[PDB]
Amino acid sequence: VEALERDIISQNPNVRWDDIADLVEAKKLLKEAVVLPMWMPEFFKGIRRPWKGVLMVGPPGTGKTLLAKAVATECKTTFFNVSSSTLTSKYRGESEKLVRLLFEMARFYSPATIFIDQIDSICSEHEASRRVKAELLVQMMVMVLAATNFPWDIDEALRRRLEKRIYIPLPSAKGREELLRISLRDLASIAENMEGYSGADITNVCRDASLMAMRRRIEGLTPETMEDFEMALKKVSKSVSAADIERYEKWIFEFGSC
Numbered sequence: 001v002e003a004l005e006r007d008i009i010s011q012n013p014n015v016r017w018d019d020i021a022d023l024v025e026a027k028k029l030l031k032e033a034v035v036l037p038m039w040m041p042e043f044f045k046g047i048r049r050p051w052k053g054v055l056m057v058g059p060p061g062t063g064k065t066l067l068a069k070a071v072a073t074e075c076k077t078t079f080f081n082v083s084s085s086t087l088t089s090k091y092r093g094e095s096e097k098l099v100r101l102l103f104e105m106a107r108f109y110s111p112a113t114i115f116i117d118q119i120d121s122i123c124s125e126h127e128a129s130r131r132v133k134a135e136l137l138v139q140m141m142v143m144v145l146a147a148t149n150f151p152w153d154i155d156e157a158l159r160r161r162l163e164k165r166i167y168i169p170l171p172s173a174k175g176r177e178e179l180l181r182i183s184l185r186d187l188a189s190i191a192e193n194m195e196g197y198s199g200a201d202i203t204n205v206c207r208d209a210s211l212m213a214m215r216r217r218i219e220g221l222t223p224e225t226m227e228d229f230e231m232a233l234k235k236v237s238k239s240v241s242a243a244d245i246e247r248y249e250k251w252i253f254e255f256g257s258c
Contacts, residue, residue: 001095005102012081014069020199021178022062025168029056029067032166035074042141051164053144055119057151057256058168058248059240061198064147067168068115077111077143084118088129096128099135112142120148123155137161151251165256167248170198170240179203184210186226193230196238196245208232 018026032054041048056064065081072079080102087096106112116136122129133155140161148154171179177191179199183206197205213228252258 001091001098002101005098005105009080009082009102010078010105012069012079014073014079017070017074019070020063020066021175021182022171022199023175023178024172025062026067026070028166029071029168032164033071033075035071039075050143053140053162053164054146055151055154055159055162055165055256056145056147056168057165057252058149059170059198059245060149061200061240062168062170063199064168065115065117068113068117068145068147071145072113072115072143075111075113075143077113078106078109080106080112080114082114082116084116085121087132088122088125092125092128094131096132096135099132100139103139106142113145114142115145115147117147118149119146119158120150120153122158124153133158151248151255159255165252167252167256167258169248170196170245171202175199176202180206183207186229190229190233193233194238196240196242198238198240201236201238205229205233205236208235 032051038050042050056067058064069079069081082102087099091098103114106114122133136158146162170176173192173195176197176199177187179202180187180191183203209229209232213232214225
């Protein structure tokens with residue numbers, strides 16, 4: 001199916017750079033994307049070129065899929081929001097040669113970016129998954145970006161194809177402080193308290209801390225806040241264990257250029 005590719009994947013129109021805090025990661029993803037540079041080596045000189053594959057690896061809740069659009073929007077490229085899990089699911093019939101055709105569509109549109117979310121979920125209809133991996137290989141001007149919350153389950157075959165591998169981490173004490181701000185409009189001691197908490201764990205621990213405690217004590221007593229935070233801060237987990245965070249750091253030491 002050609003026409004239906006255009007409405008969902010080809011265009012989910014991206015137009016922003018700096019958003020949702022995460023200032024430390026955005027920078028890193030901005031130093032390796034090198035937009036103000038990257039247009040130029042693309043333009044005229046060879047021997048020095050864009051990365052033949054960029055793998056974003058890291059913990060969830062960092063929203064790397066947003067960071068994809070955030071890169072493609074600055075280089076003024078046509079953006080492709082292709083899920084890796086979507087090709088195996090939505091197209092059983094030999095329509096998977098449409099990975100190749102997809103790349104052909106990218107070449108057609110001069111500036112292009114092909115983001116593949118959930119790369120890890122490929123080898124995991126096995127035969128279909130085997131075919132699509134092959135089409136992805138033979139295909140790999142444009143730009144190709146990948147994303148995985150499980151870098152370890154990426155096979156060594158597609159891994160090598162990824163030239164640049166970068167770690168997209170959780171918000172540090174400064175992001176999680178400002179995420180606290182965004183979720184509310186005293187925040188300092190709360191932010192530095194414990195690492196690991198992702199933006200989602202933050203933007204909900206606020207809500208508990210906000211009124212699940214506040215209203216409860218005004219609805220509790222008679223008719224006729226900082227304490228609540230720490231109280232309801234330990235009624236939520238991080239959903240990313242220190243050991244799991246320890247895992248990403250290890251993978252990026254052994255396969256990533258950090």
